[PDB]
Design a protein around this ligand. Sequence first.
Ligand SMILES: Cc1noc2c1-c1ccc(cc1)CNS(=O)(=O)CCCc1cccc(c1)OC2
Lengths: 10, 249
Amino acid sequence: KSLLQQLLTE
Amino acid sequence: YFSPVMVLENIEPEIVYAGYDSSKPDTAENLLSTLNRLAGKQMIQVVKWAKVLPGFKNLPLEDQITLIQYSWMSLLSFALSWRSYKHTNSQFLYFAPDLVFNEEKMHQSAMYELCQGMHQISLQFVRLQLTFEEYTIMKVLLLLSTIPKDGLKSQAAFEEMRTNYIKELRKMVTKSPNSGQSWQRFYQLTKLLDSMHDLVSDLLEFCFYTFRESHALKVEFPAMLVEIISDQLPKVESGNAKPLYFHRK
Ligand SMILES: Cc1noc2c1-c1ccc(cc1)CNS(=O)(=O)CCCc1cccc(c1)OC2
């Protein structure tokens, strides 16, 4: 997971 | 589909510090590295803001990522224009409370002409007496102003969200009429939004150049920016980006 994916899904 | 504007006012990210070291020499590399560190921190705020933006969650994850990646420079520039207007009456570029650009810093950053282009947007805020309500809706429209040439995974869902924020902007301008007419103000705001694309094109050209030669120029990029630019740079340079204009040419 990319930084954007992690931030958007957390 | 849906007060969405009152939600926007409450979810606006709080101002953050640049962490600017005024003891270090004000070289172009030190100022640019500070600006990059600040952009990385602001991009974390942009993602947290987008997550709670009414309607954004309806879009698929892949589209949410695409929209943030294409619009990041637009959102950061528009917020900088707002802070400049609100805190200095657009006399200076208010990057952060600890980093305010005067003529000296614009020259030292080796970005004088781009800074002037930005200063011109903040001067339009003064001319228009842009309100906070107008600003928040316009910022959402910027998040939704650039898409892939072949469109999004859920194009219909995107168009519905975009249309509904355009309706919100048109409802909002009625609160600032001249005669009692507000069509004039609506077209002044859409003209302003359209003019962000050319300014952002120039900012991205500079950004991409510094990214491609960062170590040679001594410019540091935080992880958030490395990830965004690495995805965006080949998409933008290959013409896969599609800026959405209210008024063509
Ligand atoms: C923080 C921040 N607050 O506002 C903005 C940023 C920002 C955005 C992107 C980058 C840095 C800083 C990326 N690196 S760059 O393009 O080389 C430097 C461009 C400097 C510059 C000048 C005028 C507007 C503008 C950026 O964008 C507004």
